[PDB]
Design an enzyme around this catalytic site. Structure first.
Site, short mmCIF file in Angstrom:
data_model
loop_
_atom_site.label_atom_id
_atom_site.label_comp_id
_atom_site.label_asym_id
_atom_site.label_seq_id
_atom_site.Cartn_x
_atom_site.Cartn_y
_atom_site.Cartn_z
CB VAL A 159 23.62 25.76 -4.62
CG1 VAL A 159 22.68 24.95 -5.52
CG2 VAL A 159 24.97 25.07 -4.46
CB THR A 162 26.03 28.69 0.21
OG1 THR A 162 27.13 28.95 -0.67
CG2 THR A 162 25.19 27.58 -0.36
CE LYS A 217 2.15 0.91 -5.62
NZ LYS A 217 2.74 -0.15 -4.78
N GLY A 238 0.77 -1.24 0.00
CA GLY A 238 0.00 0.00 0.00
C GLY A 238 0.79 1.29 0.00
CG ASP A 270 12.03 20.50 -6.54
OD1 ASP A 270 11.07 19.84 -7.00
OD2 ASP A 270 12.67 20.17 -5.51
CG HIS A 306 10.71 15.44 0.50
ND1 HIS A 306 10.33 16.77 0.51
CD2 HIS A 306 9.83 14.74 -0.25
CE1 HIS A 306 9.25 16.84 -0.24
NE2 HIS A 306 8.91 15.64 -0.73
NE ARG A 344 -2.48 5.70 -9.14
CZ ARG A 344 -2.28 4.43 -9.45
NH1 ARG A 344 -2.26 3.50 -8.50
NH2 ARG A 344 -2.13 4.07 -10.72
CG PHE A 346 23.05 23.77 -1.42
CD1 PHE A 346 24.39 23.43 -1.25
CD2 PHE A 346 22.21 22.86 -2.05
CE1 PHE A 346 24.87 22.19 -1.70
CE2 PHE A 346 22.69 21.64 -2.50
CZ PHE A 346 24.01 21.30 -2.30
CG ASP A 348 5.03 14.53 -6.89
OD1 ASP A 348 5.62 15.36 -7.63
OD2 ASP A 348 5.38 14.27 -5.70
C1 LIG Z 1 5.18 10.87 -4.66
S1 LIG Z 1 6.35 9.62 -4.17
C2 LIG Z 1 7.91 10.45 -4.10
C3 LIG Z 1 8.98 9.84 -4.77
C4 LIG Z 1 10.25 10.39 -4.73
C5 LIG Z 1 10.47 11.57 -4.05
C6 LIG Z 1 9.44 12.20 -3.38
C7 LIG Z 1 8.15 11.65 -3.39
C8 LIG Z 1 7.19 12.44 -2.55
O1 LIG Z 1 6.55 13.37 -3.05
N1 LIG Z 1 7.12 12.14 -1.25
C9 LIG Z 1 6.32 12.89 -0.29
C10 LIG Z 1 4.87 12.50 -0.33
C11 LIG Z 1 4.03 13.02 0.81
C12 LIG Z 1 4.21 12.30 2.14
C13 LIG Z 1 2.89 12.25 2.92
N2 LIG Z 1 3.13 12.18 4.35
C14 LIG Z 1 2.85 13.18 5.19
O2 LIG Z 1 2.21 14.19 4.86
C15 LIG Z 1 3.33 13.00 6.57
C16 LIG Z 1 4.01 11.93 7.10
N3 LIG Z 1 4.33 12.01 8.44
C17 LIG Z 1 3.89 13.13 8.91
S2 LIG Z 1 3.08 14.17 7.80
C18 LIG Z 1 2.04 11.07 2.54
N4 LIG Z 1 1.16 11.13 1.57
C19 LIG Z 1 0.61 9.87 1.51
C20 LIG Z 1 1.17 9.04 2.46
C21 LIG Z 1 1.06 7.58 2.63
C22 LIG Z 1 -0.04 6.89 2.12
C23 LIG Z 1 -0.14 5.54 2.23
C24 LIG Z 1 0.87 4.79 2.88
C25 LIG Z 1 0.79 3.38 3.04
C26 LIG Z 1 1.76 2.70 3.72
C27 LIG Z 1 2.85 3.37 4.25
C28 LIG Z 1 2.97 4.73 4.10
C29 LIG Z 1 1.98 5.47 3.42
C30 LIG Z 1 2.05 6.88 3.28
N5 LIG Z 1 2.08 9.83 3.11
CA LIG Z 2 20.98 28.88 -1.63
CA LIG Z 3 8.93 21.60 -6.23
ZN LIG Z 4 6.67 15.11 -4.43
#
Ligand SMILES: CSc1ccccc1C(=O)NCCCC[C@H](NC(=O)c1cncs1)c1ncc(-c2ccc3ccccc3c2)[nH]1
Ligand SMILES: [Ca+2]
Ligand SMILES: [Ca+2]
Ligand SMILES: [Zn+2]
Length: 369
Positions: free
Chosen positions: A187, A184, A25, A21, A168, A135, A265, A181, A259
């Protein structure tokens, strides 16, 4: 003119499983590779398998304690490290999974190899779709990322480049890169993301412009839900053109998080693949050494389309909208087309809002020498 592209990929990347879940992926990278291979793009670029980045490479930015934890934690010895897991933010969002450390090594390996390859002037563009994990913090995992390959790759570029520009286009704010960064002028981190009302990661305010010697070297464009190709397109070229004029960089790193696409999603934006790829084309006109990374994306069929097209754009290769047959053909139904259509969602970003934020950004850009 047409540039030399070096592409990095490890056939094993798609086998790393984050857990039942979980929206991250790694299989999406194997779908991407399979699609661009099936379109014939291998004949126009160098394919390389990245090495597995060492703890020495990772500790150029990360702390030894955090890297040692990462290289020893496993689903079996999990109960033993209960305190360390909390300290490094390893749990629900960034789970402990089989081969976690190896995945980080492959993701990082390609970014650093691309930076080295660009540094030596052996390529004009380097592409690592398994990278772009923006992140991850110095001693803390965050938002499905564990090792910040982008920061490490920027540190590599800083060896032969005085000024590096980081852009980004992921839907989320690139907090980890900005923080690394923040103080500085070497960057400049420019980030376009969705902002407000408890949206991950919480940072990225327009008023966040950098600190100390880095004041005016952190640019943030906060957007609302529903941004379309037209709205994004009117802000991206003018901001990037001004940043190029004032900052004058010698190398660029462009994180291409998918995303921010329509129907993602985890995202609430409404860009199509042509709108998202327009950013790669814009950056490419400045003919500067470019490192192209991956990032976010949960609708894996759209991620594979997006990065296949952005690889084609980087090659200046025209590919048909009709998808070629591939190992995941059924994922692209019911149209079996490369391009996507935008949804009927409301674009909360009024054109006046877009122009107001852009205006305030240009004010801050006047402050550079
Ligand atoms: C898009 S995948 C990606 C790939 C590469 C680099 C970056 C990304 C990215 O955008 N990552 C960040 C996404 C948002 C994180 C966000 N979490 C929070 O808000 C908080 C968490 N702790 C405190 S607040 C979140 N959105 C959905 C879930 C989620 C859903 C199902 C899950 C089922 C199993 C286990 C975990 C799961 C996490 N978590
Ligand atoms: Ca900077
Ligand atoms: Ca961005
Ligand atoms: Zn993202």
């Amino acid at each position: 003119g047409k540039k030399k592209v070096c592409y990095y990929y490890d056939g094993d990347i798609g086998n790393y499983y984050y857990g039942q879940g979980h929206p991250m992926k790694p299989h999406r990278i194997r779908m991407t590779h399979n699609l661009l291979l099936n379109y014939g793009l291998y004949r126009k670029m160098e394919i390389y398998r990245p090495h597995k980045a060492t703890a020495e490479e990772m500790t150029k930015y990360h702390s030894d304690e955090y890297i040692k934890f990462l290289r020893s934690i496993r689903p079996d010895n999990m109960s033993e490290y209960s305190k360390q897991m909390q300290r490094f933010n390893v749990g629900e969002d960034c789970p402990v999974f089989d081969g976690l450390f190896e995945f980080c090594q492959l993701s990082t390996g390609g970014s650093v190899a691309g930076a080295v390859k660009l540094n030596r002037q052996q390529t004009d563009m380097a592409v690592n779709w398994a990278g772009g994990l923006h992140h991850a913090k110095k001693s803390e995992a965050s938002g499905f990322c564990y090792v910040n390959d982008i920061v490490l790759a920027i540190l590599e570029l800083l060896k032969y480049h005085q000024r590096v520009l980081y852009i980004d286009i992921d839907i989320h704010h690139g907090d980890g890169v900005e923080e690394a960064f923040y103080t500085t002028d070497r960057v400049m981190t420019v980030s376009f993301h969705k902002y407000g009302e408890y949206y991950f990661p919480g940072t990225g305010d327009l008023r966040d412009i950098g600190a100390g010697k880095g004041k005016y070297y952190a640019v943030n464009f906060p957007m609302r839900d529903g941004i379309d190709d037209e709205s994004y397109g009117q802000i991206f070229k003018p901001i990037i053109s001004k940043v190029m004029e004032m900052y004058q960089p010698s190398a660029v790193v462009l994180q291409c998080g998918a995303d921010s696409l329509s129907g993602d999603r985890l995202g609430c934006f409404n860009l199509t693949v042509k709108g998202h790829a327009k950013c790669v084309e814009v950056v490419k006109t400045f003919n500067l050494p470019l490192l192209m990374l991956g990032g976010g994306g949960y609708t894996i069929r759209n991620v594979a389309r997006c990065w296949t097209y952005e690889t084609a754009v980087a090659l200046d290769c025209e590919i048909p909208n009709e998808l070629p047959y591939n190992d995941y053909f059924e994922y692209f139904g019911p149209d079996f087309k490369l391009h996507i259509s935008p949804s009927n969602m409301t674009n909360q970003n009024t054109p006046e809002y877009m122009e107001k934020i852009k205006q305030r950004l240009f004010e801050n850009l006047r402050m550079l020498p």
